[PDB]
Amino acid sequence: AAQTNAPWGLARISSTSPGTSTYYYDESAGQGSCVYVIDTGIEASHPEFEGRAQMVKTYYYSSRDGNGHGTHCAGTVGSRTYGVAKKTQLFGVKVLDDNGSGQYSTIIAGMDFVASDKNNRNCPKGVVASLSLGGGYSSSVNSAAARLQSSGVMVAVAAGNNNADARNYSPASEPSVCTVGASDRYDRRSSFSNYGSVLDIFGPGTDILSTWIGGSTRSISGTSMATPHVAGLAAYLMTLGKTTAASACRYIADTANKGDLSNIPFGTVNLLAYNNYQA
Numbered sequence: 001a002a003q004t005n006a007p008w009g010l011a012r013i014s015s016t017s018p019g020t021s022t023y024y025y026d027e028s029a030g031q032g033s034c035v036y037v038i039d040t041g042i043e044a045s046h047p048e049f050e051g052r053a054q055m056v057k058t059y060y061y062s063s064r065d066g067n068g069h070g071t072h073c074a075g076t077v078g079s080r081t082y083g084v085a086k087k088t089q090l091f092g093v094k095v096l097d098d099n100g101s102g103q104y105s106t107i108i109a110g111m112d113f114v115a116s117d118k119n120n121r122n123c124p125k126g127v128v129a130s131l132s133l134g135g136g137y138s139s140s141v142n143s144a145a146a147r148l149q150s151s152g153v154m155v156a157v158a159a160g161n162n163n164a165d166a167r168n169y170s171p172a173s174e175p176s177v178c179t180v181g182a183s184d185r186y187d188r189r190s191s192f193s194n195y196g197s198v199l200d201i202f203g204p205g206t207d208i209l210s211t212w213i214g215g216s217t218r219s220i221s222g223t224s225m226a227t228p229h230v231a232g233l234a235a236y237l238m239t240l241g242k243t244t245a246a247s248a249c250r251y252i253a254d255t256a257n258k259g260d261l262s263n264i265p266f267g268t269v270n271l272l273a274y275n276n277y278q279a
């Protein structure tokens with residue numbers, strides 16, 4: 001399949017070169033997979049989700065996304081125009097309030113919720129969780145992400161936006177999950193992206209157009225935007241049968257575009273997520 005005039009990041013993930021604008025992908029499109037977006041919620045009524053998004057859990061007075069961040073991330077995973085995996089099922093878990101803030105204890109509860117809740121869902125092709133959030137180092141937060149991964153969920157987490165070594169942030173610093181840095185449309189490391197040995201992969205993170213609340217769209221930047229590209233890619237590849245939740249991060253690194261990013265510090269992987277789709 002070919003989506004013309006796609007957001008640059010979608011075109012980038014199906015290309016050996018920057019500077020193109022068509023996204024190419026297998027029409028299976030993540031059908032039969034599920035992606036949990038653990039964030040501020042998802043505006044499931046947005047036409048871009050086509051009925052494939054729903055809220056499954058909130059820790060606050062509403063499950064609605066009063067911020068936009070979670071809706072934007074969900075759109076990059078799986079919206080019809082802005083998404084990597086255009087036929088996946090999206091499940092929202094609202095661990096962050098409408099200001100984007102959340103206690104680590106709530107975030108941990110949300111991760112353990114997903115590890116159990118997947119047993120209540122139909123995801124024959126596999127389960128992914130996208131975590132566009134984080135804070136300072138916490139062994140308990142890292143352990144929660146490790147449990148979620150161990151339970152059979154492909155966990156993708158944002159590296160963080162401090163232009164610093166991600167070893168000091170959680171869940172970014174958990175070794176067993178997939179830690180995602182951000183790149184721009186010219187294949188430069190995004191100016192804010194964290195780096196370091198704990199990163200597994202880069203995805204498009206600067207000026208990413210996606211869904212927003214009020215049935216709208218907007219372009220924003222962050223490792224929060226790169227993470228759902230990788231989560232959606234994992235769901236897409238699991239639907240194709242090319243990898244599993246346990247091995248998807250490694251498979252994505254194995255098959256990535258290699259050595260093409262600039263301003264990658266010595267000791268950080270130079271790997272850009274790539275679907276290797278041959279039309």
Ligand SMILES: Cn1cccc1CNCCc1c[nH]c2ccccc12
Nearest residue numbers: 069099100132133134135158159160
């Ligand atoms: C404040 N706000 C608004 C919407 C969402 C948020 C939460 N921030 C998400 C971005 C982020 C901040 N610190 C991190 C550390 C590691 C990984 C990601 C992050």
